[PDB]
């Protein structure tokens, strides 16, 4: 039987758009997208990845309140993702910002210790201007590094004046990779990382 996303699409569901329900289960096919504007890398491949699963589990990959002691985990909400008439954010990601005047370099790793695949999603924030970049990340030049046994990318914030989309001039790109059992993913960044908070374990 199909997975019913109702008002949402796969992007809004899998990122955790606050308007979208967060779920083990299975389905044969899949029947509010990104509340923050941006590009979703490999989106159609992800739709196909998720099209039929035999067990699916949402799990807290990086516990929000215990993982990021040198960064701010609470101001990272936006009117673009509002909920209960208040600013909010994707339920599966975490918008890290500076604390105490600094955004130190972070380094965070996860090993898939399960006996099935793990789907990890993250984002990179692209401010519209350099003043907002400095306000949030305390430096004009930042990087996000994501490495696993078969994935290696370094992301550079693209700062540029852009049309307002859903009220926002900034953007947020979304990315993902899969981890087989025993594979390790490492996040390194000194700004702009929208960190994993919940990830997914699934089987084909």
Author numbering: 50 to 72, 75 to 82, 89 to 261
What does the paper say about this structure?
Hemagglutinin (HA) is an IVA surface protein that allows the virus to attach to host cell receptors and enter the cell. HA is a homotrimeric glycoprotein, with each monomer composed of two regions: (1) the head, comprising the receptor binding domain (RBD) which is crucial in viral attachment, and (2) the stalk, that is responsible for viral and cell membrane fusion in the endosome. Mammalian IVA infection is initiated through HAs binding to α2,6 sialic acid-linkage galactose receptors on the host cell surface, before entering the cell via endocytosis. Following endocytosis, HAs undergo conformational rearrangements due to the low pH of the endosome, leading to membrane fusion.
In addition, we also solved a 2.0 Å resolution crystal structure of the refolded head of A/Fort Monmouth/1/1947, which appears quite similar to the lower resolution full length mature trimer structure.
